[PDB]
Amino acid sequence: DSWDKDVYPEPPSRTPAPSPQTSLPNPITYLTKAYDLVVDWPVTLVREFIERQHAKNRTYYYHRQYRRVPDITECKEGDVLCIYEAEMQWRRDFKVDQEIMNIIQERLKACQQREGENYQQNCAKELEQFTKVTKAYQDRYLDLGAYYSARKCLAKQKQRMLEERKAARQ
Template identity: 65%
Template sequence: MPADYDKGAYPEPPRQTPVVDKQTALPNPALILSKLFYYSVDLPVTTFRDAVDSIRAKNKIVYYHQKFRRVPDLTECKEGDYPCYYEAEMQWRRDYKVDQEIVKVIQERLRACQQREGHSYQQNCAKEIQQFNEVTKNFQSRYGDLGAYASARKCLMKQKERMMAAQAQNA
């Protein structure tokens, strides 16, 4: 409200918060405990975290380029070595995701070239088309027909069957 309003016509509204009616001269124990907690626990922890965050802000680590060490393949695991089986399975899943992303990137490059070149893309994007066909053929030969529950073991069996079929064809 402006400072020069008519106080008779517009009286001040009543206050919403009631006046504290102190019954005792003793301090409030909840207030004492909250202040004690704040100064003994919260303030030091917050100050330490802020100091650590300021140091980490200078030395940012890029987490999306995490590098995992290569682990042995399923063929190199000894019989009954379940941790080795698990690590090989996780390695296969990471490789599968990387191969999927490679196919997506090559596909995006091909689409961008087709968009850029228009009707003459067959001629001008021959290199991208050939690269896309090669990548999809390799992806299909490795991961195709594995189904929804693909695993390193299924992929290994598919590779073994493909090698046996090629060997029988050569013989």
């Protein structure tokens, strides 16, 4: 996994430092040491064997880059050709505008789980990053129905700017 998932230094791990009287064997390491030879040692060999067959018949794929294909403000009314491209250009970003929001969600939960009862003042960095997102999201895509087409988003963005230059008049 890439280094964009805030994997903050993975162990701040503690150390084994016993202090009982007439010290006992701990069932964790008395058993997990009995675990990394019996089911990890097989399964580590198997995938170690799966890998070498994959590089025999190795196969590649790619990402399918895309283009700008001008958006709607350059585009003509009625002319279905242009708009259709720009339209399926926008719904083509409506996902990528929204799979991001899946990542922050995905990132906004794992924070406090790797912080437990700290939970705040160590996830504000991630939480401030969230309101920052959600505010543009709603300001992009809130009032819309399910027939969301770029002519509506474009109007939503255009009703808004009027107040942005109507409230700058007093």
